[PDB]
């Protein structure tokens, strides 16, 4: 069965690796190697498996549906700041002060490796998104790794990492997330809608009818309520003039 | 009391007093008796239901 998995790697970049550092409950350094043929993840409930899943989706989308598996379409309790803060549910914060959290993934297509990255850090004790400092990395270079990026950050600020990218072949970095996401989409020749659908799949859960399947899971709405609002306002001006 | 609950509880209470043969005992249908007594006591303004 799993032989078609290698055919997928020939047709596509398949992701099998992870590098983590202080993400959520995963304190210190941790890493994972994954089989090309497919893989599983296990552990006692409330141990960090969905935390790892969310770790993966943080690198891939501007905003994911954090812990969407638990909610079933409802708002996530967690977010980037909580994971980098090591929230545990109200000491409950593992990283209250100036800290760092690194996450990365690796892929391969026809033996050619590609690694994504994200160096996070609070330079403050406050946990606002503004205080949430970040840098994003896209790599076609196998020799660039999350451990290397962590070391370079330890040497100095983002300027050392961007300078490292300039010195390093097949590497790109972006202190602005949307540039990194655009680079990733351009590499894979597909719009961000595919990644949004992927994230929906990451927490795929219940529904009520066949119609709901399409409407919610499959499609993107782009309803025209803003158009109706502006139309109503312009028509109100027209009504003023007519009166 | 919701009227259905009240009448059921009343039909239960009246059954206890079938042992009190010295006053009316319903021979065949206690529920009808309870409903009739609730009607009657509404008629006497003892109980008003809304």
């Amino acid at each position: 069965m799993n032989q078609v998995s290698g055919l997928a790697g020939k047709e596509s970049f398949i992701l099998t690796r992870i590098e983590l550092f202080n993400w959520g409950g995963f304190h210190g350094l941790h890493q994972a190697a994954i089989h090309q043929d497919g893989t599983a993840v296990i552990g006692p409930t409330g141990s960090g498996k969905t935390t790892l899943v969310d770790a993966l989706m943080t690198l891939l989308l501007a905003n994911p549906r954090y812990n969407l598996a638990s909610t079933g379409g409802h708002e996530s309790d967690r977010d980037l700041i909580s994971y980098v803060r090591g929230v545990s549910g109200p000491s409950h914060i593992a990283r209250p002060g100036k800290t760092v959290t690194g996450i990365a993934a690796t892929l391969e297509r026809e033996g050619k490796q590609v690694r994504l990255g994200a160096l996070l850090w609070f330079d403050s004790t406050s946990s606002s998104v503004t205080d949430m400092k970040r840098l994003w990395l896209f790599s076609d270079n196998p020799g660039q790794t999350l451990e290397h990026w962590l070391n370079v950050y330890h040497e100095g600020g983002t300027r050392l990492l961007r300078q490292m990218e300039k010195e390093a072949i097949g590497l790109w970095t972006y202190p602005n997330k949307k540039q990194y996401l655009a680079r990733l989409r351009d590499f894979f020749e597909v719009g961000e809608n595919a990644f949004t659908l992927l994230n929906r799949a990451a927490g795929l859960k219940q529904l009520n009818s066949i119609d709901e399947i399409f409407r919610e899971l499959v499609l993107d709405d782009h309803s025209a309520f803003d158009r109706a609002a502006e139309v109503a306002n312009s028509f109100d001006g027209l009504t003023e003039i007519h009166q | 009391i919701p009227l259905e609950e009240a009448i059921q509880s009343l039909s239960s209470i009246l059954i206890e007093h079938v042992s009190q043969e010295q006053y009316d005992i319903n021979q065949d249908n206690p529920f009808l008796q309870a409903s009739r007594e609730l009607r009657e006591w509404i008629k006497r303004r003892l109980i008003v239901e809304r």
């Binding site: 409930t45 598996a69 967690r78 929230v87 549910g89 109200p90 | -």
Partner: protein, 148 residues
């Protein structure tokens, strides 16, 4: 949200849950404001509080024991691990509740560990037939299948 906050009583309050030390007022737990988003702890907490409330409602005033002991439950166990599921069953029994657990053919082992009987159901097209068994008869039938 504002309309409910005004005219609906319960929305005027935020509900919080905590874990208490048996011997003392000591407390380290709080499920309120920030739920924590635990993928297993929230499930056990919700099932536990729901069971307690349901027992209190089921128990006629005065009595600590529900009069209608039966309860129905579902794949909350599937979301739960083995240990937390066992905690769920223990809590359910301790509150005076007899229960019935439904699952689509999985997590058998802990059920066998903490339940006595089972019922099997069939799907043979547009039909379904079901029989009641004890765990041991099912085990013997499994052995018969394993032999041949």
């Amino acid at each position: 949200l504002g309309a409910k906050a005004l005219l609906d009583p319960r929305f005027r309050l935020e509900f919080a849950v905590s874990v208490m030390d048996r011997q003392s007022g000591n407390v380290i737990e709080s499920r309120t404001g920030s739920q924590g988003g635990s993928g297993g702890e929230k499930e056990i907490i919700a099932s536990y509080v729901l069971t307690a409330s349901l027992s209190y409602a089921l128990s006629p005033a005065g009595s600590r024991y529900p009069l209608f002991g039966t309860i129905i439950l579902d794949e909350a166990f599937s979301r739960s691990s083995h240990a937390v599921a066992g905690r769920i069953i223990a809590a359910l029994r301790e509150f005076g509740l007899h229960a019935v657990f439904i699952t689509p053919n999985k997590e058998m082992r802990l059920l066998r560990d903490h339940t006595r009987s089972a019922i099997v159901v069939h799907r043979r097209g547009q039909n379904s037939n079901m029989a009641s068994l004890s765990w041991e008869e099912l085990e013997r039938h499994y052995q018969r299948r394993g032999n041949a």
